[PDB]
Structure 1
Amino acid sequence: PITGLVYDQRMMLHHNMWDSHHPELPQRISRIFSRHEELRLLSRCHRIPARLATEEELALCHSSKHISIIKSSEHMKPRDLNRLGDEYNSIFISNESYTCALLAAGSCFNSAQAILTGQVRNAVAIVRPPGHHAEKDTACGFCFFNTAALTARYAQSITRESLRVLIVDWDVHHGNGTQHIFEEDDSVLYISLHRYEDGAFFPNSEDANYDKVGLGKGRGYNVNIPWNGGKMGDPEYMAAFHHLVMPIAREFAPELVLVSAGFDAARGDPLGGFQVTPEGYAHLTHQLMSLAAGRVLIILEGGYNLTSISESMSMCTSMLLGDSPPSLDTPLKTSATVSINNVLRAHAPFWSSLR
């Protein structure tokens, strides 16, 4: 029952040349790593090395032109970095950004390989920049390449094309890129919980609503759980898992679970406005560990309170290592009941576990 951990300080080099306080900070990953040492988790893990994804591995999900554009930024002067970055929704670029995005993906590929070949049972990937907003053909929302989507395809490339991969995306934002990549795919089940606010919260698209269930043979394999009008936390996330995430995931019977684990829904996050606790994230991790024979890979996405993300992600690793889960409690906010029931009705036709 070995737990793997991948972290490489080099991923700190991606930075914002124009705003030292921009929340997607280099030290997001170093602080999470430090907390693993401070709590004596690091020495309990098997250290998986980082590596660069290849351009051909990026082609598992991304266009040749998109790869070339981000690749070219390694050599741009600040004026061109500014202008290129501004062509996307919510992107800053430095000369190190391409290499950091390659390291984040390659790290996750090595973690998936270690799990699927039985070298470790589960793993955590402390990586930046994030991935879940990146589309096949564009960067978006701090993300250059879709690390989680690429890891699902990489996992399939080294196993079989029909490998059943579950992606649970608990970042406070909808993973538009991940949804779109797998929207017509019945081999990758995408489940997102996210603040939505009737389309008003980033990334500001009705694609994140509950009635988007997938397309074609993918119908039923895209599960959006959108929150509106409330400061959601442990009660609402635990109820979403109990009524939705776990029954669906158990019926799907994945062979590999990837977590797009942003910690921006955490209590204390300056952007998310939510109040999930570190014990709440530990609960969610422990629930997912009952799937896929425990084959869970936790991939950092967003999360901007350094203290909050460090404690939260460390608690997830504690669960992966087999430590006893914390006990949690307790009325939901009323709009969360509405949201959950809206998803249930959208997905009851496709999942017998919901009937």
Structure 2
Amino acid sequence: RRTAFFFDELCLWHAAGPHALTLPVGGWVQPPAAAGHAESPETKRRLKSLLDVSGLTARLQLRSAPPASDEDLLRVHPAHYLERFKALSDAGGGSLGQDAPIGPGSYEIARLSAGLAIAALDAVLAGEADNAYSLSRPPGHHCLPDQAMGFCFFANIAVAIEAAKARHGVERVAVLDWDVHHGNGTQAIYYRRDDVLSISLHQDGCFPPGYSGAEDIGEDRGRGFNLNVPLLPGGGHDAYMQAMQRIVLPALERFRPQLIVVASGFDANAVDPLARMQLHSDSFRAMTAMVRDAAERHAGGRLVVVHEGGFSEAYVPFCGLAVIEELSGVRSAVRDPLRDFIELQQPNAAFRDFQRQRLEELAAQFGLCPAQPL
């Protein structure tokens, strides 16, 4: 297949002020001697490097894009949010919102991240590639129209969708968000809309803290077009496969997407500090295969994967590689050195059965019929 890889080196240069993991430094939180801010470029840089030495980058359609225009940004964000962000960015950086720290030139880099998402959807809708992967940093799926949060400063996917509707007139877009945290920004923006189906798989109560959201299925015109699957902390491969089979694929069947966008965070991986799930790289590969198959059946193959979270520098690269291998249909020589180990750590039969029963009940609560793909 022809997979477009949207990347820009400048996205790897965004960096907020001092933070111990996610905690802003100051008060009782000592400055890290080595690491720094959780939303680090290193994870994304190590993904890019691995894609290069694996030979996969050479088999992709490597592309950049112009930064998002104010016009594109103003579809979702107000001008005063843009001016504030810009002011803080030009001032040297600071705090923009709830866990939304920025540095100098963060405005420009945020615009570029959104621009990559816009271009990726565009390329796939124009027929310039069968599918695409956008290595967007900073990420977007937590950002509300007037509030930065969770290290997201623009609602990247929303911005790209609004631009895609204005340029191409696409009527039905499915957004599957498998970042381990709740896609609250996407949910809120499209909550009363039936032209975008927003699905989030997330760790129950992880981020935003305490939010599960199963009963939040959208409202009025959007009722049934938002679906939250709050997975129990500690779940892994089987929990996600069962979620994909019992909820996601049936929701997609009913919706008939013309384009599928995946908010692909890799923070459900088994060594991530910011969640408690147990996925391995083959979990991501299998989720991508299922969504690629869905895109081929409904949307003429039109699939865009946008990079969101993932904070294990060691392991995120293997997970991202697996997704890109699956999009492109090229298998590299890279073997995941943690895969066998993570297999042994998975929930036991009793726990897996408990989670399976909860997903069966959730599928029934959503009114989803267990048919197969066609």
TM-score by length of 1: 0.90
Q: Out of 204, 211, 215, which is 2:209 matched to?
A: 204
Residue 234 of structure 1 deviates from its aligned partner by 0.9
**2:252 is equivalent to residue 256 of structure 1:** no
Give SS of 1:177's match: helix
**2:63 is equivalent to residue 48 of structure 1:** yes
Is the 2:117–2:306 Cα contact (8 Å) retained in structure 1? yes
Is the 1:263–1:308 Cα contact (8 Å) retained in structure 2? no
**2:199 is equivalent to residue 227 of structure 1:** no
- The separation in 2 between residues aligned to 1:233 and 1:35, in whole angstroms, is 24
Q: For residues 103-252 of structure 1, what are the structure 2 equivalents within 5 Å?
A: 103-160=112-169, 163-196=171-204, 199=205, 201-204=206-209, 206=211, 208-228=212-232, 230-252=233-255
CA offset digits 1:62-99 (Å, max 9, x no partner): 2222222112222114xxx33x33xx211111012111
Segments of structure 1 that go 5 or more residues without pairing to the other structure are: none
**2:37 is equivalent to residue 22 of structure 1:** yes
- The separation in 2 between residues aligned to 1:123 and 1:236, in whole angstroms, is 27
Give SS of 1:47's match: strand
Give SS of 1:105's match: helix
Q: For residues 310-325 of structure 1, what are the structure 2 equivalents within 5 Å?
A: 310-323=317-330
CA offset digits 1:96-139 (Å, max 9, x no partner): 21111111110111111111110101011112111100001110
Is the 2:177–2:262 Cα contact (8 Å) retained in structure 1? yes
CA offset digits 1:197-244 (Å, max 9, x no partner): xx4x221254x411100011100000000023x411111101110111
User: What amino acid does structure 2 have at the position aligned with 1:346?
Assistant: Q
Is the 1:263–1:312 Cα contact (8 Å) retained in structure 2? yes
User: What amino acid does structure 2 have at the position aligned with 1:316?
Assistant: V
Is the 1:168–1:190 Cα contact (8 Å) retained in structure 2? yes
Q: Out of 275, 278, 284, which is 2:278 matched to?
A: 275
Is the 1:13–1:96 Cα contact (8 Å) retained in structure 2? no
Corresponding residue for 1:333?
A: 352
Is the 2:89–2:102 Cα contact (8 Å) retained in structure 1? no
User: What amino acid does structure 1 have at the position aligned with 2:121?
Assistant: A
- The separation in 2 between residues aligned to 1:21 and 1:70, in whole angstroms, is 22
Instruction: Check 1:101–1:338 CA distance in 2 against 1; reply closer, same or farther (3 A cut).
Output: farther
Q: After the TM superposition, which of the residue ranges 21-30 and 137-146 deviates more from structure 2?
A: 21-30
Is the 2:231–2:239 Cα contact (8 Å) retained in structure 1? no
Give SS of 2:83's match: helix
Residue 324 of structure 1 deviates from its aligned partner by 7.0
Residue 17 of structure 1 deviates from its aligned partner by 2.5
Give SS of 2:261's match: strand
- The separation in 2 between residues aligned to 1:214 and 1:338, in whole angstroms, is 24
Is the 1:265–1:275 Cα contact (8 Å) retained in structure 2? yes
Corresponding residue for 2:288?
A: 285
User: What amino acid does structure 2 have at the position aligned with 1:59?
Assistant: L
User: What amino acid does structure 2 have at the position aligned with 1:141?
Assistant: G
Q: How many residues align?
A: 341
Q: After the TM superposition, which of the residue ranges 67-76 and 102-111 deviates more from structure 2?
A: 67-76
Residue 51 of structure 1 deviates from its aligned partner by 1.9
- The separation in 1 between residues aligned to 2:357 and 2:217, in whole angstroms, is 18
TM-score by length of 2: 0.86
User: What amino acid does structure 2 have at the position aligned with 1:239?
Assistant: Q
Instruction: Check 1:27–1:70 CA distance in 2 against 1; reply closer, same or farther (3 A cut).
Output: same
RMSD: 2.3
Is the 1:32–1:126 Cα contact (8 Å) retained in structure 2? no
Give SS of 2:101's match: coil
CA offset digits 1:291-318 (Å, max 9, x no partner): 2222111111000001221111111010
Residue 338 of structure 1 deviates from its aligned partner by 4.4
Is the 2:246–2:360 Cα contact (8 Å) retained in structure 1? no
Instruction: Check 1:69–1:342 CA distance in 2 against 1; reply closer, same or farther (3 A cut).
Output: farther
Is the 2:281–2:322 Cα contact (8 Å) retained in structure 1? yes
Give SS of 1:274's match: coil
Segments of structure 2 that go 5 or more residues without pairing to the other structure are: 20-34
- The separation in 2 between residues aligned to 1:307 and 1:115, in whole angstroms, is 31
Give SS of 1:124's match: strand
- The separation in 2 between residues aligned to 1:346 and 1:223, in whole angstroms, is 11
